[PDB]
Design a protein around this ligand. Structure first.
Ligand SMILES: CCOC(=O)c1ncn(-c2cccc(Oc3cccc(-n4cnc(C(=O)OCC)c4C)c3)c2)c1C
Ligand SMILES: [Mg+2]
Ligand SMILES: [Zn+2]
Length: 312
């Protein structure tokens, strides 16, 4: 009989795709609990275990400029919006798994790409040859679930448990944006040829993968001041990586070269055209009620075009 509630402006705005979770770090756990309770029910997780899990998840995000705890909770909130706008398309196990997958999807990120790990010769790049950080993030998720009093999935059968951990693994692996391009091409073709079948688990897998990319990129779907200030955070990481590439004797790609600051506007255009727009385009085709993510992304592309024209 303990319903989590938010102040009125949050209670209403949290249901919208463009909600920003705000700069009050200590409200993020309650925002997440509010979302699980509304998306899943007060019954899906024992509150004391969920609280302990969220707090260990928080502790295992690092204080990097972008791939931090705020990103975790932001990506969960977009997933919550998709789930609440497409109620009857998702299983009970999918609703439980996917908000958790989003909270956990960047666990123990260090602010460097899979590439940099591979060029540095980091031990994780020997353990996990592809989707290096993303296998690490799942591995950290499983480690936190196995802490005493942290198994939020305790109530599930042996079957359901294997099923949810497999939804989470695939969800997290899909956030490897190298995998996005092929996934979306396949989903586009299936949607157009009419072969797309949500009863085919393999198809559901691809659709959940696209939702994961959509949630992961959701900074591009926010109010322009959120979008622009978040871009400054992600380039802070990208340029520190470029600095590290130069320290290994490697000229970085332009996106990671702080000497090519000037070129950010045009690089955002490429990003919106090559990744973001197509991502939310295909998502809106498959799940019509996600359309506000596409429309917001398009709006933000047009703000980046204005930056380029010196109209800001
Ligand atoms: C918080 C906002 O999230 C982002 O901004 C974001 N999130 C992921 N990615 C990303 C990761 C890997 C490849 C990629 O894919 C693309 C695709 C097409 C263009 C680009 N691109 C972006 N900037 C430059 C650049 O040179 O800036 C110069 C400083 C270039 C080339 C990145 C895009 C970006 C840019
Ligand atoms: Mg990631
Ligand atoms: Zn992420």
């Amino acid at each position: 009989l303990m319903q989590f509630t938010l102040p009125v402006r949050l209670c209403k705005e949290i249901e919208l795709f463009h909600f920003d979770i705000g700069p009050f770090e200590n409200m993020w756990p309650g925002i997440f609990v509010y979302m699980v309770h509304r998306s899943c029910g007060t019954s899906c997780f024992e509150l004391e275990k969920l609280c302990r899990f969220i707090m260990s998840v928080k502790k295992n995000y690092r204080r990097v400029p972008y791939h931090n705890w705020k990103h975790a909770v932001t990506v969960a909130h977009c997933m919550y919006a998709i789930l609440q706008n497409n109620h009857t398309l998702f299983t009970d196990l999918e609703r439980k798994g996917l908000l958790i997958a989003c909270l956990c999807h960047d666990l123990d990120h260090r602010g460097f790409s899979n590439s940099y790990l591979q060029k540095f010769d980091h031990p994780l790049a020997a353990l996990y040859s592809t989707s290096t950080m993303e296998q690490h993030h799942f591995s950290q998720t499983v480690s936190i679930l196995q802490l005493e009093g942290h198994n939020i999935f305790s109530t599930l059968s042996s079957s359901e448990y294997e099923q949810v951990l497999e939804i989470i693994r695939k969800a997290i692996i899909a956030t490897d944006l190298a995998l996005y391009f092929g996934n979306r091409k396949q989903l586009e073709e299936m949607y157009q040829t009419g072969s797309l079948n949500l009863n085919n688990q393999s198809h559901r897998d691809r659709v959940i993968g696209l939702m994961m990319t959509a949630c992961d990129l959701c900074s591009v779907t926010k109010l322009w001041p959120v979008t622009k200030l978040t871009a400054n955070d992600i380039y802070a990481e990208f340029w520190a990586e470029g600095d590290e590439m130069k320290k290994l004797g490697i000229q970085p790609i332009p996106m990671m070269d702080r000497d090519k600051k000037d070129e950010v506007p045009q690089g955002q255009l490429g990003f919106y055209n090559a990744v973001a727009i197509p991502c939310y385009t295909t998502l809106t085709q498959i799940l019509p009620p996600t359309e506000p993510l596409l429309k917001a992304c398009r709006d933000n592309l047009s703000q980046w075009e204005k930056v380029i024209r010196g109209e800001e």
